[PDB]
């Protein structure tokens, strides 16, 4: 076996920029990786399965290049519902010009290129070396929730479940 992008990222994270340009042969394989964490290959008489335990983080531009406020959101993606359903925390970072928001981002970026520090002075972020250890240590835990919040979830789910029926139409 010669490991590709997904197989190498086993027990890791795979970033896929420009995801909207992916072909059907690319995205169809993504479904099995997203859903099953495995890759099944049946070629030249070989029938094997590969471990594909990966976290998929995809960032892509809108289908029509950009977003205008008059445009509906679903028209700005080339992806069907099945892929969007397999994603979680599906973000949509629209850019809207604003004299009070572009000013902050411009000031943030211009300080990054001016000095070797983040613009914030009251907060110092954790260095990556310490971040890696804490994340690794945190990853070792296996929390289990209580039955009280277990009943809470089924109420909040129904709350969110019923709303989308009105929202979609």
């Amino acid at each position: 076996l010669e490991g590709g992008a997904l197989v190498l990222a086993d027990n890791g994270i795979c970033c896929i920029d420009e995801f909207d340009k992916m072909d059907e042969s690319d995205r169809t394989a993504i479904h099995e990786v997203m859903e099953q964490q495995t890759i099944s290959i049946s070629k030249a008489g070989i029938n094997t399965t590969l471990n594909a335990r990966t976290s998929i983080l995809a960032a892509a531009n809108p289908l029509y290049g950009r977003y205008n406020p008059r445009l509906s959101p679903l028209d700005n993606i080339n992806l069907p519902a099945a892929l969007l359903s397999r994603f979680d925390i599906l973000f949509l970072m629209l850019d809207i010009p604003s004299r009070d928001d572009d000013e902050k981002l411009a000031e943030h970026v211009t300080y990054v290129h001016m000095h070797n520090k983040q613009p914030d002075l009251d907060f110092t972020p954790v260095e990556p070396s310490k971040m890696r250890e804490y994340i690794a240590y945190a990853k070792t835990k296996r929390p289990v929730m209580s039955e009280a919040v277990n009943d809470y979830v089924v109420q909040a789910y129904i709350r969110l479940r019923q709303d989308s029926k009105r929202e979609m139409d």
Binding site: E2, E103, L105, A106, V109, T110, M114, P128
Partner: protein, 573 residues
């Protein structure tokens, strides 16, 4: 032979009269004593010092390396083992085994050569070769000295193995099967852990296409790397190698095209005026310095002053920024040109190849494909500028993969198996023509060139140039051609001086104007050649830094932002 000892003594006298080499060895020994990692047994000897002390020994090394360098090797090894006590018994018997290698530096004179200038008259001599590394092989150790032990006797006997591929002089063929019995007939024991090994690798240095003559087949040389310098350069590196250009095998003398296998036993690897400085700095003090360097960009081509200005700024380039977080920031500027033909599109594109210190001119393979993986056209562009014509002819794979090179300035191999990251610190300039034969100004460039906005907008400056049917343009554009029926070398020195000796930095005063103009651009709702995003803010920083390169100042001033903003609006309006 007795003369061998005299030649050894000359190197001992050479070391005595130049304390710098031996005190450096003592400093190395002290460093090794403090760690008792261990530094290798190699020092560098300047040829100029050897020439000034003993020309014959210096000339002897160059002309007869097999008869002059081993005397130097023995002299250095003897001095190293005798300058101090080497007190540790067990460690001395192993660590001091390694002979002390030599390396050469300085002016080579007639022997300063290239793979093409190198000829058979220079064979069996020491030469310095400058070229480009094409490919390398796996590092493997060379057996030097073995140690034998008989169980019935309890004493050690050692055997050496030498061959012409590492030995300067052609010794009697040593290699054979490993022995099994000693002189007494007792069965010997193979002590793997007490044998001495030296790593070995062969590289292929080639004459650069930058200097190769037209219509002639290439010249290349095989270089052997040993011991510590066995891995010093990667494929594509511009390297300077000093070694013994030596032959191997036989040219069919025993048992037709077969020639003697000439190659270089490399022993040293170095990867690659005042009056000019007094001229570059002096001429920059006039008030109109920037316009002078914009005119000298293909002066026979009329008009297109702003694109010439943009090309010059691209040549100067910005400053890639790195942080303690490990971040890398874009510092290169990319330009794309669009419109109807017959407007000197390829003429200026050709001119860039004739001006930059390093440039690659190709056409729409771009990335590394598969195994060592071949270096693509964009891969070979590191630290250079890329000139691509027929930019519309890019395939689907090229169009989707160029995104990383355009912005991140990195090339990432993610093919089946090997994964690696390759530097792509290159500025990209390209030109394109409308598919439908003629350009339509009533429609946006995305609707004409058919390249997606996600690709067109990645270029910092997008120029749409169209020859109007106006007679006044036709008069000047024809008269300038008919009229054909500060120097360029100085300009190229100016670019060489500016890109290396000055690194401008930002200042809040420039930020006061740069942020203000970007805020205005985001606020201005008028139609423009590209929708304003944060990329323009980075472009302004690069353009202002690029102008500071021209002014030869470590800081940034108001005029640097004023020019950067003005030109950016020109490419947008």
């Amino acid at each position: 032979d007795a003369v061998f000892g005299d030649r050894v003594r000359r190197f001992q006298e050479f070391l005595d009269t130049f304390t710098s080499y031996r005190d450096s060895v003592r400093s190395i020994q002290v460093y090794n004593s403090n760690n008792a990692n261990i530094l290798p047994h190699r020092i560098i000897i300047s040829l100029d010092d050897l020439r000034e002390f003993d020309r014959s020994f210096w000339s002897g090394i160059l002309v007869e390396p097999a008869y002059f360098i081993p005397p130097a090797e023995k002299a250095l090894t003897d001095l190293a083992d005798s300058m101090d006590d080497v007190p540790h018994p067990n460690a001395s018997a192993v660590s001091s085994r390694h002979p002390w290698k030599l390396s050469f530096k300085g002016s080579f004179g007639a022997h300063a050569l290239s793979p093409r200038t190198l000829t058979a008259q220079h064979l069996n001599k020491l030469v310095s070769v400058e070229g480009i590394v094409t490919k390398t092989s796996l590092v493997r150790p060379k057996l030097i000295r073995s140690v034998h032990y008989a169980a019935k006797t309890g004493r050690f006997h050692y055997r050496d193995y030498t061959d012409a591929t590492t030995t300067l002089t052609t010794r009697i063929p040593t290699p054979a099967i490993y022995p099994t019995e000693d002189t007494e007939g007792n069965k010997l024991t193979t002590e793997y852990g007490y044998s001495t090994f030296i790593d070995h690798q062969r590289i292929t240095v080639q004459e650069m296409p930058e200097m190769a003559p037209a219509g002639q087949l290439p010249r290349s040389i095989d270089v052997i790397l040993d011991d510590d310098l066995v891995d010093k350069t990667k494929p594509g590196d511009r390297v300077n190698v000093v070694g013994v250009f030596k032959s191997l095998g036989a040219g069919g003398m025993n048992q037709t095209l077969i020639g003697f296998k000439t190659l270089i036993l490399g022993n040293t690897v170095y990867p690659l005026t005042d009056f000019d400085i007094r001229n570059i700095n002096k001429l920059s003090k006039k008030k109109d310095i920037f316009d002078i360097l914009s005119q000298s960009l293909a002066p026979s081509i009329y008009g297109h002053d702003h694109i010439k200005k943009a090309i010059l700024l691209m040549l100067m380039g910005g400053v890639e920024k790195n942080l303690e977080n490990g971040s890398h920031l874009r510092g290169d500027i990319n330009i794309l040109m669009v419109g109807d033909p017959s407007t000197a599109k390829s003429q200026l594109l050709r001119f860039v190849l004739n001006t930059a210190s390093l440039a690659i001119a190709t056409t729409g393979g771009l990335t590394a494909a598969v195994t060592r993986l071949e270096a693509g056209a964009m891969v070979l562009a590191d630290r250079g500028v890329v000139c691509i014509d027929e930019f519309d002819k890019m395939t689907d794979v090229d169009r989707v993969a160029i995104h990383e090179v355009m912005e991140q300035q990195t090339v990432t191999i993610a093919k089946a198996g090997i994964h690696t990251t390759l530097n792509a610190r290159c500025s990209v300039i390209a030109a394109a023509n409308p598919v439908f034969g003629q350009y339509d100004v009533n429609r946006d460039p995305h609707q004409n060139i058919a390249l997606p906005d996600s690709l067109l907008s990645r270029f910092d400056l997008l120029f749409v140039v169209t020859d109007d049917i106006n007679e006044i343009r036709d008069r000047s554009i024809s008269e300038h051609v008919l009229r054909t029926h500060v120097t360029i070398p100085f300009l190229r020195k100016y670019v060489q001086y500016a890109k290396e000796r000055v690194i401008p930095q930002l200042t809040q005063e420039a930020i006061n104007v740069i942020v203000k103009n970007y805020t205005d651009l985001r606020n201005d709702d008028n139609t423009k050649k590209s929708p304003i995003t944060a990329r323009t803010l980075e472009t302004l920083i690069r353009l202002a830094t690029a102008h500071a390169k021209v002014r030869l100042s470590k800081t940034v001033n108001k005029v640097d932002a004023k020019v950067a903003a003005n030109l950016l609006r020109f490419a947008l309006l």
